[PDB]
Write the C-alpha cells for this entry.
Amino acid sequence: AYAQWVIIIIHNVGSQDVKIKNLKASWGKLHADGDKDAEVSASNYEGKIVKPDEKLQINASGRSDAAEGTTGTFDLVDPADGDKQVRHFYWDSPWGSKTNTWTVSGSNTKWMIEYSGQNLDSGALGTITVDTLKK
Amino acid sequence: AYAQWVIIIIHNVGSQDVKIKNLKASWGKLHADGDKDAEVSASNYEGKIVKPDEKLQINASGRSDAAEGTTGTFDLVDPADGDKQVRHFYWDSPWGSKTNTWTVSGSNTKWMIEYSGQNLDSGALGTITVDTLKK
Amino acid sequence: AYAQWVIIIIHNVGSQDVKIKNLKASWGKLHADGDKDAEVSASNYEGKIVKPDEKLQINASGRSDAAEGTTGTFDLVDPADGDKQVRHFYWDSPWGSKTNTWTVSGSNTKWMIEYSGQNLDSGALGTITVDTLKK
Amino acid sequence: AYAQWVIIIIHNVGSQDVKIKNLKASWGKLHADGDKDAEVSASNYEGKIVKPDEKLQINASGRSDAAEGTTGTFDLVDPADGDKQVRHFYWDSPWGSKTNTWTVSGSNTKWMIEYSGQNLDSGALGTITVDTLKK
Amino acid sequence: AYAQWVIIIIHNVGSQDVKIKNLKASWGKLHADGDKDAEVSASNYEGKIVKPDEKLQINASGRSDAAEGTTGTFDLVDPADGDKQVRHFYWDSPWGSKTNTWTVSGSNTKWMIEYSGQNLDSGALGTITVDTLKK
Amino acid sequence: AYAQWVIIIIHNVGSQDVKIKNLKASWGKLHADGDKDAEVSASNYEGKIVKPDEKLQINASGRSDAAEGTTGTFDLVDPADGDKQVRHFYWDSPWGSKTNTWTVSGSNTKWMIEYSGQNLDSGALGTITVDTLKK
Amino acid sequence: YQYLSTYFGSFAHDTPPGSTLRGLRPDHVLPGRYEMHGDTISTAVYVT
C-alpha cells in the first residue's frame, strides 16, 4: 500500500564526493517527489554523485493499495578510492508487520555517517535524513 | 488512533531566542519521542525558549484505538520583542478525511520560517522540520 | 515460563563510566543470577554506574509456569555528557512465537558497542555479552 | 532435542599453544556455528591447536526433536611437554533430567583454567567460555 | 524422616578466615550435634567466621517421621576479599529417590577445597569433611 | 541389611608402626571401599601394619537386605614391644535395635587413641575416624 | 607508584627484559592523553 513509504535524504555535510550504487527495491517501487503515482526506475539514482553541500532524495513506496510494503538496499561508495564501500543501507517498511527495519552495515573509518528521523515502531518508515562526512 | 501522527522539529538556526506559546492539542494527545503510550502535557513545552542551534521536538498522535485523528495549534513568538508573534502553526491529521493539513500563518517580517517534510495526500501527516531565523 | 530466559552482561571495556537508565521488564521478571525464583526489582539496576573494567549482569525470564515469555528495554547513557543517550536496548524471548529479538538502536558516535551471543531461531534468547567503550 | 545444546569456547588468554584431543560426543552431535542442522565430525576439532589470543568454538546439540540430550568429553593438552593433559572436560545436557553436568577434572600446576557462563539448574547447558593460560 | 541425614564438617586448614553465607535448608531441618530433636536456626551459622585451624559442624536431617528427606545450600566466601564467593555447596538426601547428591560449584582459584566422606548410592548422605585452604 | 554399615579409618598421627590383629566380623561382612557387593575376607587386613602418616580403611556391612546388622572386633597392637595390645575395638550396628555400640577397651599408657564421627542414636554406625599416636 | 605501559608478553620477574622494568614514584608522573589505534576492541591499543 501507499501507507508503506520511506524517504531517504542523502545530505553531504563534507567536501568530498560520494556515489550511490546498487540501488534496488525488491518490494515496492521508487517514485517521484510528492508523487507516489510517478514511478521512476532505479537508473535515475544509480551511479549518481551527491556533490558536497547538496541533498539527494530517494522516495520508495508500496504498490497502490496493495498488501505489499517497500524493501530496498543501496551502497554509498567513495569514488576517490576506487568506489570502495562507505556503508550499506537497507530499509524495510512492510505491510504485514509493525517492525520497520533500517540497517546501516559496513565499515569505513575514513567516513562518518549519521542518520535521523526513522520510525521503527509501527506504520511508515518516515523521512530518514543521512548526513555523510569524509574525515 | 495511532495511525494518525505528526512530529514537529523546531530548529532555531538563527542567533536569537524564539519562544513557544499557546500550544494546544485540540484532538489526540502529545507524547514523548518513540513512545506514543507515554502521554505528556502541553505545559512541558509551553513557554519554552529554543536557544540558537537548539532543536525541540513535539510529538502528537491519536489516542488508543479511538476514531479520532489529531489536531493542534501553537505560536512562535519573539521573547526579545515583547513576545510579539512570529508565526501561528496549525496541524491536522484527521482519521476520517484522507487529506491532512499543515498551515503556517502570520506576517512578522524580521523572521524567516521554513517548514518541510509534511505529507498532505493520505496517511499520517509525518515529520515536519521548521527552521527558524531572525533577521 | 522459565523456558524463556535471557542474560545480559554489560562489560565496560573502555576507560569512562556508562550508566544504565529506564530499565523496564514489560513481560516476565528479573531475578538474581542462578535463581530464577529470587525475583529482583528494576531499581536494583536503575541508575547504576558501570565503572571501567566492571561487569554487570541482568537476568530476566518468564514467571512461574505462565504462558508469558519475557520482554524488556533499557538505555545505556553517558554520565559524563549530561546523561546523553549512548544506546537503546530491546530484548524479547516470546513463549508463543518461536523467533526471538535483540535490537540495539541509537546513533551516539563517540561510543563503540558490540553485542554477541544471542540466539534468534528458537528457544531462549540466551546470554548476550555487550562490550562498551567510549572513544 | 535441539533444546539440549551447549557451546564451548576455548579462549587462550596466555602465550603458549594448547591442543584439543579426544573430543568425543557419546550423545548428540557436533554441529556448525548457528546451524544445528549442519552436523560436523569430531575430526574438524581433534588435534587442532588454539593459538594464543584467539578463540575456538565447539557446538554440540541433541538430535533433532529427539528424546536425547548431548553428552561429550575432550582433553585440553599442552603440546610443549609431549601432549600432557592440562584438563579433562565433560559436559552433559540431558533431555530427561534437569541437572546438567560440567566437570573439569585433571591436574596441571603449570596451567590455569577458568570457565564461566554454564547453567546447571534446568534447560540447556548454555555458552561456557573457558579461559586458558600457561604460567 | 530421621533416616535421611547429613553432617558437614568445614575445616579451615589454611591460615586465613573463611565465612559461611546464604545457609538455607530448603527441606528437613538443622539440629544440634547428637540431638536430631534439638532443632536450630540457620542464623546460628549465617555469617560465621571459621578461623584457621577451627572446625565447624552443620547437622541436617529430615523432620519427625515426615516423608521428606533433606536438602540445603550454602556458600563459602572470603571475608578478606570483599566477601568474594569461594564455593557454593548443595546437599540433598531425598527420602523417595535412593540416590543422594553433594555438589560443589564455583571457580575461585586462590582457594583449595577438598570434600570427602559422602555416600551417593542409598541411605543417608553421611558425614562430609570439607578442608578449606587459601593459597 | 546394607542400611547397617560402618567405616573404620585407622589414621596414624604418630611416627611408630601399629598393627591390626584378630579382625573378626561375627555378624555381617567386610567389603570393599564404596562397594558393599565386593565381599573381602578378614585376611586382607589382619596382620597389616598402618605406616605412620597414612590411613587404612575397614568397611563392614550387613548382608544384603537381611535382618542382620554388622558386629565385629579387632585389636590395635604395637609391634615394637612384641605385639602387645594398644586397644581393643568393638563395633555393633544391629538391624533390630537403635543403640549402636562402639567400645574401645584396653589400656596402654604408651599410646594415645582418639576417635570421632560415630553415631549411637539410631541408624548406621557411620564413619569413625581413629587417630593413633605413640608417645 | 605507577608504570607507563602494559606488557606485551609474559612478565618475567627474574629474567630480562622483565627483571629491569620499573615503576615510578607518583610525583614523577603526570596524567597524559590517549591515542587509540585499531578498528576493534580486540586490537585496540592506546599510544599515550
Remarks:
- Residues 22 and 96 of chain A are 26 Å apart (CA to CA).
- Chains A and F do not touch (no CB pair under 8 Å).
- Chain A is about 0% helix and 55% strand.
